[PDB]
Amino acid sequence: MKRTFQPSVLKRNRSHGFRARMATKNGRQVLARRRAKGRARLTVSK
Amino acid sequence: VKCKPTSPGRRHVVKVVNPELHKGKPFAPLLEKNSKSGGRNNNGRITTRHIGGGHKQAYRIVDFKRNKDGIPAVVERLEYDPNRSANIALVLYKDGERRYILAPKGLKAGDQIQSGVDAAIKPGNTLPMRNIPVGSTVHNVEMKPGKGGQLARSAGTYVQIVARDGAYVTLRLRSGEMRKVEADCRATLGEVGNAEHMLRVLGKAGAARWRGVRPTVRGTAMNPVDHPHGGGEGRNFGKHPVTPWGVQTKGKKTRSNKRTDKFIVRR
RNA sequence: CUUUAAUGUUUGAUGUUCUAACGUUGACCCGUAAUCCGGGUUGCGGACAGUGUCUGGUGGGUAGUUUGACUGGGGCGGUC
RNA sequence: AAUUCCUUGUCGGGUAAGUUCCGACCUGCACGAAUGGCGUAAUGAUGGCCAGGCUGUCUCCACCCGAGACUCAGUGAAAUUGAACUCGCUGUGAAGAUGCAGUGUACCCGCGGCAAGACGGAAAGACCCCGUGAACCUUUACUAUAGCUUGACACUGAACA
RNA sequence: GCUCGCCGGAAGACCAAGGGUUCCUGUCCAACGUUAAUCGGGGCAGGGUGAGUCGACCCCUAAGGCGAGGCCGAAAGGCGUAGUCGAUGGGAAACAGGUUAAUAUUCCUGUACUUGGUGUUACUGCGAAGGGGGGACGGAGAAGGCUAUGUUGGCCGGGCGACGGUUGUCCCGGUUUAAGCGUGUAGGCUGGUUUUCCAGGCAAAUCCGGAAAAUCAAGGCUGAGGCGUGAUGACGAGGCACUACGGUGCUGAAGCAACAAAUGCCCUGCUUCCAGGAAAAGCCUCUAAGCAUCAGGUAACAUCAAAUCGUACCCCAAACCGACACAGGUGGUCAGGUAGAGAAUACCAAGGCGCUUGAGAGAACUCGGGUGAAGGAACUAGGCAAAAUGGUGCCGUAACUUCGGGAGAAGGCACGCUGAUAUGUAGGUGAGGUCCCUCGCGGAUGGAGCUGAAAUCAGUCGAAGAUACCAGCUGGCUGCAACUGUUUAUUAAAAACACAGCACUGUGCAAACACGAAAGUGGACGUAUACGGUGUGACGCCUGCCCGGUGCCGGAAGGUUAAU
RNA sequence: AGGACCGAACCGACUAAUGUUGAAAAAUUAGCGGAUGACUUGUGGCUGGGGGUGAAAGGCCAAUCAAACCGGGAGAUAGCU
RNA sequence: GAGGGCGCUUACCACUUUGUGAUUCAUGACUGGGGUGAAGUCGUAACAAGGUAACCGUAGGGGAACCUGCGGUUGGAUCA
RNA sequence: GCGGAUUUAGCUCAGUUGGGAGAGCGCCAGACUGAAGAUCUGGAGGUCCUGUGUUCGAUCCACAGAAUUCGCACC
């Protein structure tokens, strides 16, 4: 019902977390295809 | 519940006749020596014990074994236990120690509570049955020789000594009069504390069952996604067993360690 | 040379139990101001347990399929 | 009661009238002991008409402050599509006349009435089968895997009776 | 100016969802405000939100992460002791004044304190990884005081107050007293002080549990606050100027007591009922070692360290979300006001601020209703809509026993505004004056200053007075789920049935269940009167009866004929 | 005392009425209760696929899940105009 | 100056009802109780051992005709 | 409509290789009863649907007809 989009930090630890996107191999290919090979940036680290 | 002190229910001026009208056995604080039980069914993962409702478990009386036999003691007060219906007392051991012992109907004065090998015989801490005489009443009985008592309540459950039975291998209880547990296990005496809390229903519902668990209420009935029945239409009306495992008579055991049951009259 | 006995000499089984297997989710002792946990006196039952397939039905507690056609549209009653 | 097998069965009392406000001779197939039965506490997240209220509920709403919408200024996007200059029973049948002509002969425009008139829109019609067919729940049909269950060789010995 | 509005559980307050610095002004119109457009956090030029004490490191953890060695493991990965993370659990720990647009426990300005080094005097036997006090709860409450804050006037500043009236009995405005120290009061807890010994407390023990004497009864630990200390510390009626028109510059009245209630203070008081309100610590002390003419700790006063953030806009909720300043959601937070049963309702002062579509027109186009002559549902799937009836109390009311309840049943009724008892009755209140006492937060006499029912005798004005917003059909019927219901949000709104007893059933117990590959975690801190089958259909009776078939299973007298 | 009778925002979900050409996969206006609990109520870590908690629902579960918001099997089968 | 005539005040109080019940009539819409016994039929245990009894409170099978099992007080044949 | 059953002793229906027509029961006698039944031994009781055929012999089957009756065809 309480739909939907919102920002927060503490909810990133099981889903949205940068060190977990490197810890999991499933994230690790994405991370390189998105910046190191993908010519780009993220920088949203806050 | 012909007994006394009984506390009989009320004249109908409220929705409640029961619960139990027993003045003079709740108390506060939870004294220094206390503990609790925790979470919900949480078995790791997909729990088989149905319905749950697991809030307020909550606290329990802490004293198991109670193996201090020989040192004499006296009765301070008596309480109640919402986990067993149990009539427990608070017992001051004349050495310097305070403890919680399981009691019969009104054991106070503060009486002479002691045990010891042939030295004593009174309603006594825990006490070996090959050193005392023969009756209906016994109570604690180590569920096997040093493990811990069988009965943590004085709910009514008479275990009944036999004198010299196949050389000390004794008792006579409900569902297997061939326990053959040796009389080297420990008594205390005796089995009627508060029958009043159990022999009669406290309510329909009551605090005893809805503040921190849900009991069982269905299995078969509604939504065919769990049990072996069925189509729809309110109908039921088939053969529908408790499958793959059974119901109305079959037995379950064949082999175990100790295994002491022998003749088995059943019914 | 046997229907058969007593024994020797060759040998299988079931009862009958004792029991260093074993299991200790039982104690005492013990490394240890110790929930895991190491190891022994002891206590307990006991070749029991454990599962690998073979014989047995027991239930609709995964999955599966909708198995011709003939239809003055179907269910029956008829046929290649 | 979801049996009223028979038909809106009744005697007819009450009643401007009893296809019932019930007012106790039944015509009982396929009635009930835990899928139970003789019954009921005060409560209405109260189901079905029946009194007297108050009355405009009929038929009778013709007067109203009045929202606004057609109007006057800012602004004007698609649920997407048959050219129109689209005859008001019309007739004749690839069985339906706003276009196969027998008639009347409707000036151009209000998109203001907008009452039958894109059979229309919200959209793989619900009736739905040619379906070598998504899987979708069952039952003393069909079963199967996991399982339930004991007895069995594998495995763990013979000393005596 | 002048007359009034919206939020009225305020878009009052500070800040926690990190989105982040887009508030004040100086100035502005695309990159936007479906109108003007001056305003909108739009958006631009400046700058900014001053924290040793706020809260989170800490020492600290219930749940839960990980984890030595390991039981294991296809490669994966699973479960766990000691440890170590760990708050939304705990402990020490900002107020009156002033001052910058702001932004303010900070800034200043003083009071004076908490953790830890150090110094000069002083006193004294200390210590831990172990012991014991409790360290610790849950809400309804009950009872006494403090008055928050208000209204009044003594008292003070203004004066007799523009219409009609008003020149001592009127009518306005401040009505402040900060600190920490000082002491102790309200209920409460507990009779005081020594000596001698244990079947006790992880080895011990001046501390705890139990015992055994001695000598005395008036003993011990505070607590809202009254009360007072500070304070020739100030705030401020007003007086006189100056101006960048914000203010600041010079100076300055008055300054007492009553009366009534909290949303809050005391009360981890003290009560009442049980689902049974979680652990390491501060608070307070016992020793173990080992020091042991040494070292430690507690005290007057002297100092230094006070360990990276955050502090800006913002909320019972427009830069979250919804995504069109959206008829979704939804807060811990100061509780603003009199009459009110009430966070029941038209009324408020403020804070943002009247919310950037409104001019005329006045056909039918039902987002509707009202009082209808008649009649009274003569309408119809919906007396649907419009209601009306809604106090205490009474002139007094029916079936029915579960003797509660069915009973604010029902019925209709005096109700406005005030004489008189009564220059206010009663009831609530307790100044002084006067006396006593233990000496001080003490009591006895006494009637000052406020307040305010409830009726009785008598009035009389209505078409109307509970003259207004809160808030009800007696019924009486059918089938009794018998416990309120809110439980299938998604056809039903229950006409669903979750109760709960029990004969029987699975476990004599490493129990029944196995979810995870190795758990033994539910049940268990527990026994077949614990927990589960399948249900039960208030309560209470009553379950008659009848074994063909077909189940439920059990067994072995005995054949169908197997792994063996 | 009692899941009392009758009380607020912390509750859901009866038919309508202005909800359908949405303020809207849901909420509404004068109305109206369950009155302290068979209540709901919020920071976050344990339920991570054919799910997994059961007031026991085919409704949920992103708002339309009988398996979807996945795109890697796969530009699959193809009696298909 | 005073009443009574009135004209106000208000009641005892007739109408009237919120109500619902006493009890008396026929319209008695599932029936079952105590009998005569114009020929009733199925049955038939008891008035002697009504020809392998059972009276009495009676609880129960259920054509009861109440069988039938205690406890007597012999109104039930003896030499059991 | 087709396909089945049935027309066998008062009652209830058994039975058929296809050559005999049955019993539970009711009557009759027999005696036991004054009598009657029980129970009893004896004895009896027939549209074996009709027609035609097969056949040694048809109650029976096959076939044509008649008639009672049932399940399904109908929607």
Tab-separated table of all heavy atoms in Angstrom, chain G residues 57-71:
chain	number	residue	atom	x	y	z
G	57	G	P	-44.344	-52.677	43.786
G	57	G	OP1	-45.504	-51.804	43.338
G	57	G	OP2	-43.652	-53.571	42.847
G	57	G	O5'	-43.331	-51.767	44.577
G	57	G	C5'	-43.822	-50.774	45.413
G	57	G	C4'	-42.804	-49.758	45.809
G	57	G	O4'	-41.753	-50.418	46.500
G	57	G	C3'	-42.114	-49.067	44.594
G	57	G	O3'	-42.914	-48.070	43.959
G	57	G	C2'	-40.812	-48.636	45.243
G	57	G	O2'	-40.963	-47.580	46.111
G	57	G	C1'	-40.551	-49.849	46.178
G	57	G	N9	-39.717	-50.874	45.569
G	57	G	C8	-39.745	-51.579	44.472
G	57	G	N7	-38.756	-52.380	44.186
G	57	G	C5	-37.972	-52.186	45.353
G	57	G	C6	-36.660	-52.640	45.687
G	57	G	O6	-35.850	-53.371	45.089
G	57	G	N1	-36.246	-52.389	47.010
G	57	G	C2	-36.884	-51.550	47.767
G	57	G	N2	-36.280	-51.177	48.841
G	57	G	N3	-38.015	-50.911	47.365
G	57	G	C4	-38.581	-51.350	46.200
G	58	U	P	-43.503	-48.326	42.513
G	58	U	OP1	-43.808	-47.074	41.930
G	58	U	OP2	-44.506	-49.384	42.522
G	58	U	O5'	-42.167	-48.781	41.741
G	58	U	C5'	-41.021	-47.880	41.670
G	58	U	C4'	-39.699	-48.628	41.383
G	58	U	O4'	-39.761	-49.906	41.900
G	58	U	C3'	-39.317	-48.711	39.921
G	58	U	O3'	-38.833	-47.405	39.482
G	58	U	C2'	-38.251	-49.805	40.056
G	58	U	O2'	-37.005	-49.275	40.419
G	58	U	C1'	-38.766	-50.635	41.223
G	58	U	N1	-39.197	-51.955	40.928
G	58	U	C2	-38.221	-53.023	41.037
G	58	U	O2	-37.090	-52.919	41.486
G	58	U	N3	-38.671	-54.265	40.626
G	58	U	C4	-39.834	-54.505	39.935
G	58	U	O4	-40.037	-55.645	39.449
G	58	U	C5	-40.790	-53.439	39.872
G	58	U	C6	-40.454	-52.237	40.376
G	59	A	P	-38.528	-47.165	37.935
G	59	A	OP1	-38.566	-45.705	37.689
G	59	A	OP2	-39.237	-48.093	37.040
G	59	A	O5'	-37.041	-47.533	37.837
G	59	A	C5'	-35.991	-46.716	38.163
G	59	A	C4'	-34.686	-47.414	37.876
G	59	A	O4'	-34.464	-48.596	38.722
G	59	A	C3'	-34.675	-47.845	36.322
G	59	A	O3'	-34.212	-46.909	35.453
G	59	A	C2'	-33.694	-49.038	36.407
G	59	A	O2'	-32.298	-48.616	36.297
G	59	A	C1'	-33.935	-49.591	37.836
G	59	A	N9	-34.956	-50.675	37.671
G	59	A	C8	-36.206	-50.665	37.109
G	59	A	N7	-36.842	-51.801	37.129
G	59	A	C5	-35.871	-52.601	37.764
G	59	A	C6	-35.856	-53.966	38.328
G	59	A	N6	-36.804	-54.839	38.417
G	59	A	N1	-34.784	-54.466	38.951
G	59	A	C2	-33.722	-53.705	38.941
G	59	A	N3	-33.549	-52.463	38.465
G	59	A	C4	-34.697	-51.963	37.950
G	60	G	P	-34.660	-47.028	33.862
G	60	G	OP1	-33.962	-45.936	33.145
G	60	G	OP2	-36.150	-46.920	33.900
G	60	G	O5'	-34.342	-48.433	33.227
G	60	G	C5'	-33.057	-48.928	32.850
G	60	G	C4'	-33.136	-50.449	32.488
G	60	G	O4'	-34.073	-51.216	33.239
G	60	G	C3'	-33.574	-50.602	31.007
G	60	G	O3'	-32.525	-50.196	30.135
G	60	G	C2'	-34.048	-52.094	30.990
G	60	G	O2'	-33.105	-53.184	30.727
G	60	G	C1'	-34.356	-52.376	32.475
G	60	G	N9	-35.752	-52.792	32.835
G	60	G	C8	-36.851	-52.034	32.987
G	60	G	N7	-37.827	-52.521	33.644
G	60	G	C5	-37.325	-53.760	34.102
G	60	G	C6	-37.733	-54.676	35.125
G	60	G	O6	-38.717	-54.553	35.841
G	60	G	N1	-36.914	-55.761	35.335
G	60	G	C2	-35.770	-55.860	34.729
G	60	G	N2	-35.208	-56.981	34.820
G	60	G	N3	-35.217	-54.992	33.855
G	60	G	C4	-36.044	-53.929	33.582
G	61	G	P	-32.982	-50.063	28.637
G	61	G	OP1	-31.923	-49.370	27.868
G	61	G	OP2	-34.383	-49.586	28.555
G	61	G	O5'	-33.011	-51.567	28.154
G	61	G	C5'	-33.808	-51.951	27.087
G	61	G	C4'	-33.746	-53.486	26.976
G	61	G	O4'	-34.630	-54.044	28.005
G	61	G	C3'	-34.273	-54.133	25.690
G	61	G	O3'	-33.375	-54.175	24.599
G	61	G	C2'	-34.684	-55.584	26.268
G	61	G	O2'	-33.681	-56.587	26.193
G	61	G	C1'	-34.914	-55.355	27.766
G	61	G	N9	-36.263	-55.625	28.273
G	61	G	C8	-37.032	-54.728	29.003
G	61	G	N7	-38.034	-55.374	29.569
G	61	G	C5	-38.124	-56.653	28.935
G	61	G	C6	-39.047	-57.695	29.126
G	61	G	O6	-40.009	-57.790	29.924
G	61	G	N1	-38.719	-58.792	28.295
G	61	G	C2	-37.705	-58.833	27.440
G	61	G	N2	-37.372	-59.967	26.863
G	61	G	N3	-36.744	-57.872	27.298
G	61	G	C4	-36.992	-56.807	28.105
G	62	G	P	-33.430	-53.240	23.327
G	62	G	OP1	-32.120	-53.502	22.614
G	62	G	OP2	-33.704	-51.797	23.674
G	62	G	O5'	-34.611	-53.853	22.384
G	62	G	C5'	-35.823	-53.102	22.282
G	62	G	C4'	-37.053	-53.868	22.853
G	62	G	O4'	-37.058	-53.465	24.208
G	62	G	C3'	-38.440	-53.465	22.301
G	62	G	O3'	-39.078	-54.663	21.900
G	62	G	C2'	-39.047	-52.761	23.478
G	62	G	O2'	-40.454	-52.744	23.629
G	62	G	C1'	-38.369	-53.475	24.641
G	62	G	N9	-38.356	-52.736	25.995
G	62	G	C8	-37.310	-51.973	26.582
G	62	G	N7	-37.648	-51.513	27.765
G	62	G	C5	-38.967	-51.941	27.987
G	62	G	C6	-39.929	-51.725	29.024
G	62	G	O6	-39.857	-50.964	29.927
G	62	G	N1	-41.045	-52.511	28.952
G	62	G	C2	-41.369	-53.223	27.817
G	62	G	N2	-42.606	-53.654	27.750
G	62	G	N3	-40.606	-53.341	26.762
G	62	G	C4	-39.427	-52.699	26.920
G	63	G	P	-40.037	-54.605	20.642
G	63	G	OP1	-39.220	-55.033	19.492
G	63	G	OP2	-40.755	-53.289	20.555
G	63	G	O5'	-41.221	-55.750	20.885
G	63	G	C5'	-42.062	-55.796	22.012
G	63	G	C4'	-43.403	-56.271	21.599
G	63	G	O4'	-43.448	-57.568	21.109
G	63	G	C3'	-44.369	-56.317	22.757
G	63	G	O3'	-44.716	-54.992	23.204
G	63	G	C2'	-45.597	-57.065	22.138
G	63	G	O2'	-46.559	-56.435	21.256
G	63	G	C1'	-44.809	-57.987	21.131
G	63	G	N9	-44.983	-59.400	21.552
G	63	G	C8	-44.434	-60.039	22.613
G	63	G	N7	-44.670	-61.331	22.686
G	63	G	C5	-45.570	-61.525	21.655
G	63	G	C6	-46.290	-62.675	21.253
G	63	G	O6	-46.292	-63.773	21.812
G	63	G	N1	-47.181	-62.419	20.173
G	63	G	C2	-47.327	-61.178	19.540
G	63	G	N2	-48.411	-61.031	18.850
G	63	G	N3	-46.661	-60.139	19.971
G	63	G	C4	-45.798	-60.340	20.995
G	64	A	P	-44.634	-54.568	24.769
G	64	A	OP1	-44.931	-53.107	24.767
G	64	A	OP2	-43.410	-55.084	25.423
G	64	A	O5'	-45.872	-55.264	25.422
G	64	A	C5'	-45.899	-56.671	25.727
G	64	A	C4'	-46.548	-56.887	27.106
G	64	A	O4'	-45.787	-57.998	27.724
G	64	A	C3'	-46.523	-55.784	28.152
G	64	A	O3'	-47.403	-56.042	29.216
G	64	A	C2'	-45.051	-55.820	28.574
G	64	A	O2'	-44.763	-55.111	29.773
G	64	A	C1'	-44.767	-57.419	28.541
G	64	A	N9	-43.476	-57.735	27.877
G	64	A	C8	-42.308	-57.007	27.956
G	64	A	N7	-41.365	-57.433	27.133
G	64	A	C5	-41.835	-58.696	26.747
G	64	A	C6	-41.321	-59.782	25.955
G	64	A	N6	-40.220	-59.772	25.128
G	64	A	N1	-41.919	-60.981	25.989
G	64	A	C2	-42.934	-61.071	26.763
G	64	A	N3	-43.630	-60.179	27.418
G	64	A	C4	-43.019	-58.971	27.369
G	65	A	P	-49.021	-56.001	29.040
G	65	A	OP1	-49.273	-54.889	28.153
G	65	A	OP2	-49.560	-55.928	30.375
G	65	A	O5'	-49.537	-57.383	28.349
G	65	A	C5'	-50.470	-58.343	28.840
G	65	A	C4'	-49.871	-59.467	29.786
G	65	A	O4'	-49.370	-60.482	29.012
G	65	A	C3'	-48.624	-59.007	30.644
G	65	A	O3'	-48.715	-59.464	31.944
G	65	A	C2'	-47.513	-59.677	29.840
G	65	A	O2'	-46.256	-59.782	30.460
G	65	A	C1'	-48.150	-60.993	29.574
G	65	A	N9	-47.347	-61.821	28.647
G	65	A	C8	-47.686	-62.256	27.381
G	65	A	N7	-46.758	-63.065	26.863
G	65	A	C5	-45.772	-63.247	27.890
G	65	A	C6	-44.611	-64.059	28.106
G	65	A	N6	-44.092	-64.969	27.324
G	65	A	N1	-44.055	-64.051	29.293
G	65	A	C2	-44.490	-63.337	30.268
G	65	A	N3	-45.576	-62.536	30.226
G	65	A	C4	-46.173	-62.491	29.004
G	66	C	P	-48.288	-58.474	33.115
G	66	C	OP1	-48.880	-59.093	34.351
G	66	C	OP2	-48.727	-57.132	32.784
G	66	C	O5'	-46.688	-58.558	33.293
G	66	C	C5'	-45.860	-57.648	32.643
G	66	C	C4'	-44.377	-58.129	32.571
G	66	C	O4'	-43.673	-57.163	31.837
G	66	C	C3'	-43.750	-58.282	34.048
G	66	C	O3'	-43.340	-59.609	34.201
G	66	C	C2'	-42.668	-57.198	33.913
G	66	C	O2'	-41.416	-57.616	34.497
G	66	C	C1'	-42.416	-56.776	32.484
G	66	C	N1	-42.196	-55.328	32.351
G	66	C	C2	-43.167	-54.407	32.862
G	66	C	O2	-44.325	-54.749	33.188
G	66	C	N3	-42.897	-53.124	33.154
G	66	C	C4	-41.689	-52.680	32.841
G	66	C	N4	-41.559	-51.436	32.964
G	66	C	C5	-40.711	-53.528	32.226
G	66	C	C6	-40.966	-54.836	31.942
G	67	C	P	-43.287	-60.291	35.574
G	67	C	OP1	-44.724	-60.434	35.861
G	67	C	OP2	-42.481	-59.468	36.501
G	67	C	O5'	-42.565	-61.746	35.289
G	67	C	C5'	-41.177	-61.948	35.226
G	67	C	C4'	-40.831	-62.210	33.801
G	67	C	O4'	-40.660	-60.998	33.137
G	67	C	C3'	-39.489	-62.989	33.624
G	67	C	O3'	-39.581	-64.412	33.904
G	67	C	C2'	-39.146	-62.601	32.191
G	67	C	O2'	-39.906	-63.374	31.315
G	67	C	C1'	-39.649	-61.143	32.162
G	67	C	N1	-38.591	-60.118	32.322
G	67	C	C2	-37.296	-60.232	31.665
G	67	C	O2	-36.918	-61.200	30.982
G	67	C	N3	-36.505	-59.098	31.464
G	67	C	C4	-36.909	-57.930	31.830
G	67	C	N4	-36.313	-56.929	31.381
G	67	C	C5	-38.158	-57.694	32.432
G	67	C	C6	-38.943	-58.785	32.692
G	68	U	P	-38.442	-65.525	33.598
G	68	U	OP1	-38.221	-65.513	32.141
G	68	U	OP2	-38.967	-66.763	34.265
G	68	U	O5'	-37.111	-65.058	34.368
G	68	U	C5'	-36.110	-64.276	33.800
G	68	U	C4'	-35.502	-63.232	34.771
G	68	U	O4'	-36.211	-62.057	35.003
G	68	U	C3'	-35.177	-63.869	36.144
G	68	U	O3'	-34.059	-64.743	36.054
G	68	U	C2'	-34.921	-62.541	36.972
G	68	U	O2'	-33.628	-61.927	36.977
G	68	U	C1'	-35.743	-61.501	36.212
G	68	U	N1	-36.882	-61.003	37.022
G	68	U	C2	-36.920	-59.623	37.196
G	68	U	O2	-36.266	-58.794	36.593
G	68	U	N3	-37.722	-59.158	38.213
G	68	U	C4	-38.545	-59.933	38.965
G	68	U	O4	-39.251	-59.470	39.834
G	68	U	C5	-38.529	-61.314	38.695
G	68	U	C6	-37.702	-61.845	37.753
G	69	G	P	-33.581	-65.497	37.315
G	69	G	OP1	-32.513	-66.519	36.867
G	69	G	OP2	-34.772	-65.882	38.032
G	69	G	O5'	-32.797	-64.297	38.109
G	69	G	C5'	-31.370	-64.296	38.274
G	69	G	C4'	-30.941	-63.302	39.389
G	69	G	O4'	-31.315	-61.981	38.974
G	69	G	C3'	-31.560	-63.476	40.784
G	69	G	O3'	-31.180	-64.599	41.585
G	69	G	C2'	-31.196	-62.106	41.305
G	69	G	O2'	-29.820	-62.031	41.512
G	69	G	C1'	-31.523	-61.206	40.115
G	69	G	N9	-32.890	-60.639	40.190
G	69	G	C8	-34.134	-61.248	40.060
G	69	G	N7	-35.077	-60.410	39.874
G	69	G	C5	-34.474	-59.086	39.979
G	69	G	C6	-34.987	-57.712	40.067
G	69	G	O6	-36.156	-57.405	39.821
G	69	G	N1	-34.026	-56.815	40.499
G	69	G	C2	-32.703	-57.152	40.613
G	69	G	N2	-31.867	-56.144	40.815
G	69	G	N3	-32.194	-58.338	40.546
G	69	G	C4	-33.137	-59.303	40.215
G	70	C	P	-31.825	-64.810	43.011
G	70	C	OP1	-31.491	-66.165	43.559
G	70	C	OP2	-33.236	-64.403	42.952
G	70	C	O5'	-30.941	-63.806	43.900
G	70	C	C5'	-31.494	-63.259	45.006
G	70	C	C4'	-30.544	-62.158	45.614
G	70	C	O4'	-30.600	-60.950	44.775
G	70	C	C3'	-30.785	-61.736	47.032
G	70	C	O3'	-29.653	-61.504	47.865
G	70	C	C2'	-31.580	-60.393	46.820
G	70	C	O2'	-31.640	-59.521	47.972
G	70	C	C1'	-30.809	-59.826	45.610
G	70	C	N1	-31.540	-58.776	44.906
G	70	C	C2	-31.182	-57.427	45.146
G	70	C	O2	-30.164	-57.136	45.789
G	70	C	N3	-31.877	-56.377	44.750
G	70	C	C4	-32.957	-56.621	44.057
G	70	C	N4	-33.636	-55.537	43.736
G	70	C	C5	-33.438	-57.942	43.759
G	70	C	C6	-32.666	-59.004	44.171
G	71	G	P	-29.720	-61.898	49.415
G	71	G	OP1	-28.402	-61.522	50.008
G	71	G	OP2	-30.231	-63.289	49.525
G	71	G	O5'	-30.781	-60.923	50.104
G	71	G	C5'	-30.404	-60.047	51.170
G	71	G	C4'	-31.777	-59.539	51.796
G	71	G	O4'	-32.497	-58.523	51.085
G	71	G	C3'	-32.793	-60.679	52.066
G	71	G	O3'	-32.457	-61.502	53.133
G	71	G	C2'	-34.111	-59.855	52.165
G	71	G	O2'	-34.434	-58.963	53.307
G	71	G	C1'	-33.886	-58.850	51.093
G	71	G	N9	-34.440	-59.272	49.783
G	71	G	C8	-34.940	-60.536	49.452
G	71	G	N7	-35.707	-60.535	48.337
G	71	G	C5	-35.527	-59.214	47.856
G	71	G	C6	-35.973	-58.576	46.640
G	71	G	O6	-36.841	-58.943	45.810
G	71	G	N1	-35.515	-57.332	46.422
G	71	G	C2	-34.847	-56.666	47.403
G	71	G	N2	-34.718	-55.396	47.147
G	71	G	N3	-34.517	-57.068	48.577
G	71	G	C4	-34.753	-58.428	48.734
